[PDB]
Amino acid sequence: EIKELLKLGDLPTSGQIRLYDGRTGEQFERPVTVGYMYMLKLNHLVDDK
Amino acid sequence: MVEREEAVVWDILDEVIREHPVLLNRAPTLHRLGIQAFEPVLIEGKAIQ
Amino acid sequence: TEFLKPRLVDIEQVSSTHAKVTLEPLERGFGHTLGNALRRILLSSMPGCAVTEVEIDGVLHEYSTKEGVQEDILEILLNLKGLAVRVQGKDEVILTLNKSGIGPVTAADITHDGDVEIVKPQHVICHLTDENASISMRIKVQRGRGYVPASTRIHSEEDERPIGRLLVDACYSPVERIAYNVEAARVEQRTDLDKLVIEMETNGTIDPEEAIRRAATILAEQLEAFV
Amino acid sequence: FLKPRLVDIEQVSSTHAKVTLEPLERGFGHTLGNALRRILLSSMPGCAVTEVEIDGVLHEYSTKEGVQEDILEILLNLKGLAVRVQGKDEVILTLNKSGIGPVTAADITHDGDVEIVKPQHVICHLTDENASISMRIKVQRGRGYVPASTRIHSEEDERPIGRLLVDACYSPVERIAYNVEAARVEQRTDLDKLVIEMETNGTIDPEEAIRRAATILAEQLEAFVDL
Amino acid sequence: KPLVGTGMERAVAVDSGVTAVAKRGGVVQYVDASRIVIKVNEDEMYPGEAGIDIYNLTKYTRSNQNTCINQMPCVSLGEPVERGDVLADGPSTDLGELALGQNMRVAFMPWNGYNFEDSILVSERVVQEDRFTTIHIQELACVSRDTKLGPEEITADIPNVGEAALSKLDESGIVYIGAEVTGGDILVGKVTPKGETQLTPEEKLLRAIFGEKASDVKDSSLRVPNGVSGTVIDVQVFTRDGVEKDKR
Amino acid sequence: EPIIVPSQDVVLGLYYMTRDCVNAKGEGMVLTGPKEAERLYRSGLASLH
Amino acid sequence: ARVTVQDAVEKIGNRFDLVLVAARRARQMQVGGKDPLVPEENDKTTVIALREIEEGLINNQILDVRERQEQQEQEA
Known about the structure:
Strand order of the largest sheet of chain A: 1-2
Subunit structure (chain E): The RNAP catalytic core consists of 2 alpha, 1 beta, 1 beta' and 1 omega subunit. When a sigma factor is associated with the core the holoenzyme is formed, which can initiate transcription.
Protein name (chain B): DNA-directed RNA polymerase subunit beta'
Structural class of chain B: alpha+beta
Strand content of chain B: 15-25%
Strand order of the largest sheet of chain B: 1-2
Order of helices and strands of chain A: HEE
Largest sheet of chain A: 2 strands, antiparallel
Largest sheet of chain B: 2 strands, antiparallel
Structural class of chain A: alpha+beta
Number of strands of chain A: 2
Radius of gyration of chain B: 14 Å
Helix content of chain A: 10-25%
Strand content of chain A: 15-25%
Protein name (chain E): DNA-directed RNA polymerase subunit beta
Order of helices and strands of chain B: HEE
Family (chain E): Belongs to the RNA polymerase beta chain family.
Number of helices of chain B: 1
Radius of gyration of chain A: 17 Å
Shape of chain A: flat
Oligomer: part of a larger assembly
Function (chain E): DNA-dependent RNA polymerase catalyzes the transcription of DNA into RNA using the four ribonucleoside triphosphates as substrates.
Number of strands of chain B: 2
């Protein structure tokens, strides 16, 4: 079902695109792991350190 | 002068930083391998690089 | 809006090895826009001179034998690619090496044309051992821009089907090492601006400072449409 | 050493367009296209609201008695407004809206220099009819992300604490991709054609920007020509 | 809110008490920010003094962690609701739905030491949009009104300063309604008497002439905590049990 | 022993550097110096293995 | 900058007594008692003393000589 949705989107079946460095512009050989994940910031702040 | 952080005193700060040895010791340090010495580099931040 | 101008450049120099440019100040990603730029340009877009072809005469192979040589024809080829040469008002030129006897075959025994100037005549091409050693080669040096490997260039005349020429990698790069570095520059009350430090080396067909102004003109050239 | 040249800036939409450069040489268009990218993301004179002194607001941690949204939110929606200036770098406006309705960005004291890209951008939501919210919006021009944080150090003693500031992000540009490919001309093996696919917020014109940004590269070539 | 959750998002909102829920359905009539006036549908409208409900939202306050909590109005004007829907948003909630953080385009590639095992690398776009920022509204207690040494008054007699400090200390000597206090300024004025043993004979005589309280009451106010630069939003005052304050 | 052993990130860096395979652009040519070898891969006219 | 101090070990390799000696020399440099002889490269006195010992021009031998030399200069 997962691969089916990457196909149901204009996204790569793999989910690994070959990127171009913002500090270079070359292909990171062997498509790299890319996509969204839900982040979560903790309540640990540097002003309390 | 340092009350207003005059750019002047920062150059004087430079003079007392260029080749001034510094000692770095962590807290969770139980063994002597947590104590070394370094050289300063002016960093615009909050954490010790 | 207010812009800032690049100034203070430390030309740290050591004879012919390296010059290290220290320029201040830079901003958020300016040590990159500058560094990366020079690198690709000094690699596949920089004019220079180097050997493209080397017809010995009889033996057109690298793994054979030539009586009177302590090296192998292979080692000979490597030194040919590393020979520092520079012409002025000529594109392609072929020279001749006529050496005999026991001794280091330096870059001085070749025929010096009115444009072909070996910057390092001391550069020993091949080592020639004992007695006879009748070696004579026909070398082709050419002007180009960048680096032409023989891997991508499979010559359409005497290498597609025949032999009669050898295929080396013409090094048209007047440099040797491109290592740019980013390090925090510091404006008094201000924040961490950057300082581009460029460890750059050149062979001898050009010296550090000349090379800097050179590509500078070519940058204005490729920025001529707007700036 | 053929000079470079662009073609008509293909305007597909008002927000994003694409330029195309035919006269490129091997390598240049690649590293220079990356070098331009950084420039077209840094040295760009953007416009950002800095000081907004609101009617019944002493601090952004309050809500105007008559609005649906929160003052903090409204300030972020002010950063959501794309505005252009032509003569002066700075201008103070005054929002005057009263009546139940999504407050569009065209009810402000409209100066001839102030230029909204889309007067339909709702800043706040009025839910009452007897509430006439007014607010002087001091917007100016600069480049790169310049936050009110780094600017409150001088402060100039801002005693009038009805004046609530906001972070000035001066960046018109958005998403920059460059499409390098074989440039097909009949007199050459293959050149390079840089199809700069760009996204903007809609404030500064692309051509204005690229000649202006190339002039900033000219500034950044000054000392590179100087030895 | 997490795009790919498990379906308990609204379930957090409904089983928690961070979002103001409705106990009856109906068209909202007057929604501002701190108030949400509701008109209830007759099918479930009480035959007891009609039925217009109200929901009061906490607007930018503090917590245990001294972090900000604000019930954000999710319902606009002229929009009906159901007996079991939301009106506000507690902290870290989107339409009631549990919205802790935010999801971004995460990648996994080694790239110039900014990712050594624990080291994380993030785009400056986050703080350039200010999507991940918190508000720390802090509470600091103040004491006054009679210390056995002498009945205390708020501000009243304030020495050791000029009038520059009083630019935000009104006709009560108390801090403004939204000031930018920094470094080491004073929040509220606090006065306290001094001492017998310390008064000199050359100031015992001058003391019994230039008034009843010449060099007795000093300035020992509650000052802005050393090392903080924020903004005073709300003042929680407690008048003397029986006798009012003065004006503020 | 020189206590500091490349942990993980730096190890993989040099691991993808010195490594051998069978298929690689340019596999077979000759260079008279590792210096031009530097200017050979930074450009990318041959594979790293 | 200074990569190692192994060259100091080549001359005076006590690793600790080194600290003592050169430190006192740096203090005569502070108090106007004296001044250096080996030009500093923005290096404050600590690093300057390091250079002096690695070359081996001003070691414990010479420092004690300086001590007794000052004794003839203060006495007479």
